[PDB]
Write a protein that binds this ligand. Structure first.
Ligand SMILES: CC(=O)NCCc1c[nH]c2ccc(F)cc12
Ligand SMILES: CC(=O)NCCc1c[nH]c2ccc(F)cc12
Lengths: 172, 172
């Protein structure tokens, strides 16, 4: 995956988020620190927060990441698209996990009612674990794919089943 | 625990894998042809067992005392879904699912290679995205989970231009 996409993946709350542009940051709702009143030095007042279930978009009134170009955010992807989930692990290891995407789905995963785009890992058979699968610290990692000369972001990591085979991408 | 990934080590023109503190496996063609030592041990001290494109090194002292010993087998049952544990010099980790087939002598680009055939499960193509193998990946291990037990069953020897078909060299 290109260096510019890994540069947009920022450690945030109990997981990650992703810079779409110099002013737009996307993440999974449950990783946001609940008492928090300031983000990258800016008060709530100065930020437009757009929340659709486990998807949250932050639009800043100033350029927080002026090193970046704006890229395309889409509302999920066609069923059958192979995406990479851009996961950072212990000590600059970079894990772009291959996922085949499926339908929009509503599930119950552990306690929780989860809604988003389902997909199946293409890493291995019984992927329940940090070596071939996702862990709770991965929530907010972006789902990306290459589409002609362009890369697209189409969601953020929200959940995985007890077997680890099935993942859920929160979508705008 | 040490992760599986800490066992995958840069070696020669590719990679290899620590099965135990004293046992290292790799692809024969990536081993240097001019050497007096490996991993700081004199070649005097190293047992080398070659069988076509599969090589095993047995050291006389513990090079990786942090590891436990893993199950090494001579390939796996047809239909097993393995993971090829690819490391790249970017710092990326690429576990790719492979459906394993028959032992054969296969024509792969110019070349006759003997080992276990497999097909990558990332489909359409790996062209643009982190979804296939490249020449520098030779020696990456093939692994799978069986009950609570991780099994290593061979090393990455070859792949087609296409990228669909791979060869896993196995112990003889
Ligand atoms: C992977 C990654 O985040 N890299 C950049 C780190 C960084 C430096 N200065 C910043 C200001 C805002 C922000 F969100 C990130 C940064
Ligand atoms: C233990 C075991 O047998 N696993 C399933 C084998 C398998 C993987 N990918 C497939 C795609 C089509 C198909 F017909 C079979 C497979």
């Amino acid at each position: 995956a290109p260096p510019t996409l890994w540069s947009r993946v920022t450690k945030f709350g109990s997981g990650w988020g992703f810079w779409v542009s110099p002013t737009v940051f996307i993440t999974t709702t449950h990783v946001i620190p609940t008492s928090a009143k300031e983000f990258f030095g800016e008060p709530l007042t100065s930020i437009a927060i757009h929340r659709a279930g486990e998807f949250t978009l932050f639009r800043f009134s100033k350029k927080i990441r002026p090193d970046l170009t704006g890229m395309i955010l889409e509302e999920g992807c066609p069923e059958g698209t192979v995406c990479s989930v851009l996961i950072k692990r212990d000590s600059g290891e970079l894990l772009p996990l291959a996922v085949r995407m499926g339908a929009i789905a509503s599930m119950r995963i552990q306690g929780r009612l989860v809604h988003g785009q389902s997909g199946m890992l293409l890493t291995g058979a019984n992927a329940k674990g940090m070596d071939l699968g996702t862990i709770p610290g991965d929530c907010g990692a972006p789902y990306v794919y290459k589409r002609a000369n362009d890369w697209v972001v189409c969601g953020v990591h929200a959940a995985a089943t007890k077997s680890g085979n099935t993942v859920v991408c929160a979508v705008q």
